[PDB]
Paper text:
Moreover, the removal of 3 mutations possessing a low probability of substitution (D11P, A212D, and L221I) from DhaA222 resulted in a further increase of thermostability by 1 °C (DhaA231). The analysis supported our conclusions about the disruptive mutations and, more importantly, succeeded in identifying three additional false positives, as demonstrated by the improved stability of DhaA231. We obtained diffraction-quality crystals of DhaA223 and DhaA231 enzymes that belonged to the space groups P1211 and P212121 and diffracted at 1.5 and 1.3 Å resolution, respectively. The positioning of catalytic pentad residues was not disturbed, which is a prerequisite for efficient catalysis. Here, we show that the protein backbones of DhaA223 and DhaA231 superpose well with that of the DhaA115, although some minor changes are observed in the hinge regions between the helical cap domain and the hydrolase core. The crystal structures of DhaA223 and DhaA231 thus suggest that stabilization was achieved via strengthening intricate networks of residue-to-residue interactions, stabilizing the αβα-sandwich architecture. We show that the mutations designed by FireProt and PROSS stabilized the native state of DhaA115 and increased the unfolding energy barrier, shifting their maximal activity temperatures above 65 °C. We also observe that the stabilization of DhaA is accompanied by the destabilization of an intermediate state based on the increasing cooperativity of unfolding (most noticeably for DhaA231). The increased turnovers of DhaA222 and DhaA231 stem from a decrease in the transition state’s energy barrier (7 and 6 kJ/mol, respectively).
The target protein used in this study is the computationally stabilized haloalkane dehalogenase DhaA115 designed previously using the web server FireProt. Eleven mutations that were originally introduced in the wild type increased its apparent melting temperature (Tmapp) to approx. 73 °C (ΔTmapp ∼ 23 °C), making it the most stable haloalkane dehalogenase to date. First, DhaA115 displays activity toward a broad range of halogenated substrates, many of which are toxic and carcinogenic compounds persistent in the environment, e.g., 1,2-dichloroethane and 1,2-dibromoethane. This makes the enzyme particularly valuable for biotechnological applications that detoxify and degrade harmful pollutants.
Numbering used by the authors: 4 to 294
């Protein structure tokens, strides 16, 4: 599993801020847009993109305040990310896309797809966000930490002062041990505590027990859309998984239209770090049939 990030930096101005992105692959055809979540960046896709680039353009932005993108003075709520990703996609002139999405990247991607359904040719996803009605249904592994992240005062000390989303959640949610080199790539955007606002706001935006109400309603809306959409869907899942354990992959197989699923072996949440080759090779095999 490679640790380098051998991608030439690209930048585009978006609502006054520079956003960094990977851009590789042929200059025509439908582009494949890769959307990371918390607390990662385009680095999470580094070993997946090379499987897809031979046949399709690959675009992987760093969300605002993350990766090599700029750090505007935002709250970094989901609605801020929606604005910056919408403007990123328009600034690149993208028309139709295939989405490859994870974590908060999946909330962004599914919300964009519901609003722009004519422009989405397929969605590959993994360990994605859906509304969780009670804490008892939130995944048990690290559950008390997520409760504390959403507790006033306590959560900021954990995430902002102690950097626990990077130093604890991220390695705990990969089955294989992340190396120090990989950890240093993930640490780089957050070396100062004043850069860590997005990492704290994200878990405070998760749709749990109806709160926050605005994210809850938007996630319920894209899940209704997903259950009715004919779009081709590709779900990657691992075991024991975090948000999508085997029994949840089964419920997806039994409910979602036009779905193919791929088991990746051992995995928790950041499945890309456990088996990037199965993820990238199966995306590559599935793309031709999107016509
Ligand atoms: Cl989060
Ligand atoms: Mg500037
Ligand atoms: Mg270029
Ligand atoms: Mg910078
Ligand atoms: Mg293995």
């Amino acid at each position: 599993i490679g640790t380098s990030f051998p991608f030439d930096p690209h930048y585009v101005e978006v609502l006054g801020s520079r956003m960094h992105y990977v851009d590789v692959g042929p200059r025509d055809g439908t582009p494949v847009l890769f959307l990371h979540g918390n607390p990662t960046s385009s680095y999470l896709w580094r070993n997946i993109i090379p499987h897809v680039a031979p046949t399709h353009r690959c675009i992987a932005p760093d969300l605002i305040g993350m990766g090599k993108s700029d750090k505007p003075d935002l709250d970094y709520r989901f609605e801020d990310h929606v604005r910056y990703l919408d403007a990123f996609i328009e600034a690149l002139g993208l028309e139709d896309v295939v989405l490859v999405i994870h974590d908060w990247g999946s909330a962004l991607g599914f919300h964009w797809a519901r609003r722009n359904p004519e422009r989405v040719r397929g969605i590959a996803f993994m360990e994605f966000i859906r509304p969780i009605p009670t804490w008892d249904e939130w995944p048990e592994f690290a559950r008390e930490l997520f409760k504390a992240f959403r507790t006033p005062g306590v959560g900021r000390k954990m995430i902002i002062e102690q950097n626990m989303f990077i130093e604890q959640i991220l390695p705990a949610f990969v089955v294989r041990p992340l190396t120090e080199e990989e950890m240093d790539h993930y640490r780089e955007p957050f070396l100062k505590p004043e850069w860590r606002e997005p990492l704290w706001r994200f878990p405070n935006e998760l749709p749990i027990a109806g709160e926050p109400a605005d994210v809850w309603a938007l996630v319920e809306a894209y899940m209704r859309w997903l259950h009715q959409s004919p779009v081709p869907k590709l779900l990657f899942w691992g075991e024991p998984g975090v948000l999508i354990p085997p029994e949840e992959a089964e419920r997806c197989r039994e409910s979602l239209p036009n779905l193919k699923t791929v088991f990746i072996g051992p995995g928790l949440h950041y499945l890309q770090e456990d088996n990037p080759d199965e993820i990238g090779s199966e995306i590559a095999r599935w793309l031709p049939a999107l016509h």
